[PDB]
Design an enzyme around this catalytic site. Structure first.
Site, PDB file in Angstrom:
ATOM      1  CD  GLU A  70      -3.181   0.897   0.643  1.00  0.00           C
ATOM      2  OE1 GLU A  70      -2.597   1.847   0.086  1.00  0.00           O
ATOM      3  OE2 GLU A  70      -4.400   0.910   0.938  1.00  0.00           O
TER       4      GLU A  70
ATOM      5  CD  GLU B 260      -3.085  -7.616   4.308  1.00  0.00           C
ATOM      6  OE1 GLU B 260      -3.336  -8.831   4.468  1.00  0.00           O
ATOM      7  OE2 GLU B 260      -3.433  -6.972   3.296  1.00  0.00           O
TER       8      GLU B 260
ATOM      9  CG  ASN C 258      -6.825   3.113   4.567  1.00  0.00           C
ATOM     10  OD1 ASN C 258      -6.510   3.405   3.413  1.00  0.00           O
ATOM     11  ND2 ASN C 258      -6.947   1.858   4.979  1.00  0.00           N
TER      12      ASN C 258
ATOM     13  CG  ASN D  11      -9.590   2.764   1.372  1.00  0.00           C
ATOM     14  OD1 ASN D  11      -8.426   3.141   1.470  1.00  0.00           O
ATOM     15  ND2 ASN D  11      -9.922   1.482   1.233  1.00  0.00           N
TER      16      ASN D  11
ATOM     17  CG  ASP E 105      -7.524   0.588  -1.483  1.00  0.00           C
ATOM     18  OD1 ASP E 105      -7.266   1.523  -0.700  1.00  0.00           O
ATOM     19  OD2 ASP E 105      -7.054  -0.565  -1.339  1.00  0.00           O
TER      20      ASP E 105
ATOM     21  CG  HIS F  99      -3.904  -5.793  -1.376  1.00  0.00           C
ATOM     22  ND1 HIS F  99      -4.771  -5.105  -0.556  1.00  0.00           N
ATOM     23  CD2 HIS F  99      -2.772  -5.052  -1.433  1.00  0.00           C
ATOM     24  CE1 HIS F  99      -4.189  -3.997  -0.135  1.00  0.00           C
ATOM     25  NE2 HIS F  99      -2.975  -3.940  -0.653  1.00  0.00           N
TER      26      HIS F  99
END
Ligand SMILES: NP(=O)(OC1CCCC1)OC1CCCC1
Ligand SMILES: [Ca+2]
Ligand SMILES: [Ca+2]
Length: 309
Positions: free
Chosen positions: A19, A35, A118, A173, A227, A285
């Site tokens: 990201e 993550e 975010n 987002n 996103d 992703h």
């Protein structure tokens, strides 16, 4: 709706939840890995990528009082070569290229605990607009507004105030700022992922927004939605539609996409233009990798590319 299939070139891979792609003032490329986990606990990382070889270097693994972070979005500052990083667990961080970092705030202007962030976007006046889809920052238990509407929007002003400008969003987002030709901030665009909507506000001044309106509609019934986003030099808004294998292209006025870019992966997450080029770097992703492709024109200059003097 026309769809184009440009050539995508792999840059690097094996980056969990790839990201926040961003370029600093020296032209170096960074991305975040929200993550990454250690022993089941968040241990997100901020990495510098060598575009020549694709080699990765972890410059920072944010942690505050034993609580690891989940870095998810970035913006480079103008007056100093430092990165502002939206973290789902720690809030807003300011990271130096040497790896040292600082927590910006634990509470907002009203004394309320900060929410996890975010993504973020600077306007040309230097104010930072931020989306906050998570609940309260650590040590509070981790929660996210994917189902309930408690996501908020903040504005971190040039005079250092952290102001909540609105709330009640279902996972705010991506975020972007539309500017007038004279460089004045005009509209704030915010993506609400699950609802497949893009919202807009008129910017009247620092931390001052009005006229909330449904700006655009994201295609698909798939799980996911808008996103990350960014404008190209003609003010077309490119939006990663996570889960539908496409990046949507909206005209300056919004509404429905004017074009779609087909990606060789199902989950485009975020993107960023390489300064002064038509090259767009995209994180996704499905393979947790970073790719690049050529757009039809240069990107809109980021705040860090403008001159104070
Ligand atoms: N990429 P992101 O902004 O949202 C995508 C995952 C949820 C659907 C779209 O979430 C990042 C922060 C949490 C880890 C990945
Ligand atoms: Ca995001
Ligand atoms: Ca971007």
């Amino acid at each position: 709706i026309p769809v184009i299939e440009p050539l995508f070139t792999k840059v690097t891979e094996d980056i969990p939840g790839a990201e926040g792609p961003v370029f600093d003032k020296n032209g170096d490329f960074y991305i975040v890995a929200p993550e990454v986990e250690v022993n089941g606990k968040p241990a997100g990382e901020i990495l510098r990528i060598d575009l020549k070889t694709g080699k990765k270097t972890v410059i920072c693994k944010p942690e505050v009082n034993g609580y690891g972070g989940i870095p998810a979005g970035c913006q480079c500052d103008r007056d100093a070569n430092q990165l502002f990083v939206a973290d789902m667990r720690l809030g807003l961080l300011v990271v130096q290229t040497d790896g040292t970092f600082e927590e910006i705030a634990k509470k907002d202007s009203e004394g309320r605990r900060m929410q996890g962030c975010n993504d973020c976007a600077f306007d040309y006046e230097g104010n930072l607009w931020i989306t906050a889809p998570a609940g309260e920052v650590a040590p509070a238990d981790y929660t996210r507004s994917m189902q309930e509407k408690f996501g908020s929007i903040y504005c971190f002003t040039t005079d250092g105030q952290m102001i909540q400008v609105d709330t009640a969003f279902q996972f705010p987002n991506g975020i972007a700022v539309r500017h007038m030709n004279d460089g004045r901030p005009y509209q704030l665009i915010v993506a609400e992922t699950p609802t497949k909507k893009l919202w807009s506000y008129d910017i009247k001044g620092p931390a001052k927004i009005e006229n909330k309106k449904v700006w655009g509609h994201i295609p698909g019934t798939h799980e996911g939605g808008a996103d990350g986003m960014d404008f190209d030099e003609d003010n077309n808004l490119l939006v990663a539609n996570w889960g539908s294998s496409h990046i949507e292209v909206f005209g300056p006025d919004g509404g429905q996409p004017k074009m779609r870019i087909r990606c060789p992966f199902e989950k485009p997450s975020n993107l960023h233009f390489k300064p002064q080029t038509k090259t767009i770097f995209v994180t996704e992703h499905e393979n947790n990798a970073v790719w690049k492709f050529e757009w039809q024109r240069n990107g809109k200059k980021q705040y860090c590319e403008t001159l104070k003097f």
